[PDB]
Amino acid sequence: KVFGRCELAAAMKRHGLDNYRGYSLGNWVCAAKFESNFNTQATNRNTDGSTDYGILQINSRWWCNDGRTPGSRNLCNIPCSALLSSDITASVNCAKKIVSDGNGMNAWVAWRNRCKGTDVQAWIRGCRL
Ligand SMILES: [Cl-]
Ligand SMILES: [Cl-]
Ligand SMILES: [Cl-]
Ligand SMILES: [Cl-]
Ligand SMILES: [Cl-]
Ligand SMILES: [Cl-]
Ligand code: NA
């Protein structure tokens, strides 16, 4: 599923991301834009052999099991394929674990390079929430 901007903001708000670990909802929408273009089906291979999955590009090195990243962990206790669902529940729940790990939203390279320090409230402007 390819979400619209406000549609995703609403889904994220309902699943408790707004101000989760102090990150306002715009930060999460901005991160999803630039990680996946709001597409739950997005996948990208990394150099190390791990793959990033879903709307928040969650990596199989640590967070999910894809059966092809040897020596990796599955800290969210989910198949990576669960992160590609039109239902963002699994992604949001695993994102909460990531953002709690110590590095905040710096875990998301697109967030650090394209969202951090910018006017992220723009991403939820005009939305009904
Ligand atoms: Cl929308
Ligand atoms: Cl947009
Ligand atoms: Cl915001
Ligand atoms: Cl699994
Ligand atoms: Cl959803
Ligand atoms: Cl933080
Ligand atoms: Na893994």
PDB file of N, CA, C and O and ligand atoms in Angstrom, residues 59-67 69 72-75 80, ligand 7:
ATOM      1  N   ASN A  59      15.742  -2.897   9.332  1.00  0.00           N
ATOM      2  CA  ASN A  59      16.835  -3.745   8.858  1.00  0.00           C
ATOM      3  C   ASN A  59      16.905  -5.116   9.450  1.00  0.00           C
ATOM      4  O   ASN A  59      16.694  -5.308  10.669  1.00  0.00           O
ATOM      5  N   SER A  60      17.164  -6.118   8.614  1.00  0.00           N
ATOM      6  CA  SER A  60      17.141  -7.555   9.078  1.00  0.00           C
ATOM      7  C   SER A  60      18.395  -7.925   9.821  1.00  0.00           C
ATOM      8  O   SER A  60      18.381  -9.007  10.412  1.00  0.00           O
ATOM      9  N   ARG A  61      19.387  -7.059   9.849  1.00  0.00           N
ATOM     10  CA  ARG A  61      20.617  -7.333  10.676  1.00  0.00           C
ATOM     11  C   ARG A  61      20.276  -7.444  12.128  1.00  0.00           C
ATOM     12  O   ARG A  61      20.857  -8.246  12.862  1.00  0.00           O
ATOM     13  N   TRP A  62      19.332  -6.629  12.596  1.00  0.00           N
ATOM     14  CA  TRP A  62      18.978  -6.595  14.002  1.00  0.00           C
ATOM     15  C   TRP A  62      17.588  -6.943  14.353  1.00  0.00           C
ATOM     16  O   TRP A  62      17.248  -7.398  15.452  1.00  0.00           O
ATOM     17  N   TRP A  63      16.620  -6.580  13.498  1.00  0.00           N
ATOM     18  CA  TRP A  63      15.260  -6.339  13.947  1.00  0.00           C
ATOM     19  C   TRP A  63      14.203  -7.321  13.529  1.00  0.00           C
ATOM     20  O   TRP A  63      13.220  -7.424  14.152  1.00  0.00           O
ATOM     21  N   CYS A  64      14.446  -8.066  12.446  1.00  0.00           N
ATOM     22  CA  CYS A  64      13.450  -9.010  11.895  1.00  0.00           C
ATOM     23  C   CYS A  64      14.201 -10.148  11.238  1.00  0.00           C
ATOM     24  O   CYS A  64      15.380 -10.034  10.887  1.00  0.00           O
ATOM     25  N   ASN A  65      13.474 -11.262  11.097  1.00  0.00           N
ATOM     26  CA  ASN A  65      14.059 -12.408  10.426  1.00  0.00           C
ATOM     27  C   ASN A  65      13.619 -12.593   9.012  1.00  0.00           C
ATOM     28  O   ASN A  65      12.432 -12.627   8.799  1.00  0.00           O
ATOM     29  N   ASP A  66      14.564 -12.630   8.084  1.00  0.00           N
ATOM     30  CA  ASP A  66      14.262 -12.843   6.640  1.00  0.00           C
ATOM     31  C   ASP A  66      14.897 -14.132   6.136  1.00  0.00           C
ATOM     32  O   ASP A  66      14.802 -14.387   4.905  1.00  0.00           O
ATOM     33  N   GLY A  67      15.470 -14.878   7.025  1.00  0.00           N
ATOM     34  CA  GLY A  67      16.125 -16.191   6.661  1.00  0.00           C
ATOM     35  C   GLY A  67      17.315 -16.110   5.764  1.00  0.00           C
ATOM     36  O   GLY A  67      17.847 -17.162   5.316  1.00  0.00           O
ATOM     37  N   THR A  69      20.030 -13.482   6.371  1.00  0.00           N
ATOM     38  CA  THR A  69      21.004 -12.545   6.934  1.00  0.00           C
ATOM     39  C   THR A  69      21.754 -13.264   8.063  1.00  0.00           C
ATOM     40  O   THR A  69      21.381 -13.221   9.189  1.00  0.00           O
ATOM     41  N   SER A  72      22.359 -12.721  12.198  1.00  0.00           N
ATOM     42  CA  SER A  72      21.660 -11.534  12.546  1.00  0.00           C
ATOM     43  C   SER A  72      20.725 -11.814  13.732  1.00  0.00           C
ATOM     44  O   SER A  72      20.481 -12.957  14.112  1.00  0.00           O
ATOM     45  N   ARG A  73      20.178 -10.770  14.318  1.00  0.00           N
ATOM     46  CA  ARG A  73      19.170 -10.942  15.369  1.00  0.00           C
ATOM     47  C   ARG A  73      17.754 -10.611  14.808  1.00  0.00           C
ATOM     48  O   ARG A  73      17.599 -10.141  13.632  1.00  0.00           O
ATOM     49  N   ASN A  74      16.770 -10.830  15.636  1.00  0.00           N
ATOM     50  CA  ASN A  74      15.414 -10.610  15.316  1.00  0.00           C
ATOM     51  C   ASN A  74      14.815 -10.015  16.592  1.00  0.00           C
ATOM     52  O   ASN A  74      13.950 -10.597  17.226  1.00  0.00           O
ATOM     53  N   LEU A  75      15.223  -8.797  16.868  1.00  0.00           N
ATOM     54  CA  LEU A  75      14.812  -8.168  18.137  1.00  0.00           C
ATOM     55  C   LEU A  75      13.361  -7.808  18.215  1.00  0.00           C
ATOM     56  O   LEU A  75      12.751  -7.776  19.308  1.00  0.00           O
ATOM     57  N   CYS A  80      10.461 -10.489   8.614  1.00  0.00           N
ATOM     58  CA  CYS A  80      10.565  -9.180   7.903  1.00  0.00           C
ATOM     59  C   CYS A  80       9.373  -8.933   6.986  1.00  0.00           C
ATOM     60  O   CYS A  80       8.950  -7.810   6.801  1.00  0.00           O
TER      61      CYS A  80
HETATM   62 NA    NA B   7      17.580 -10.930  11.346  1.00  0.00          NA
END
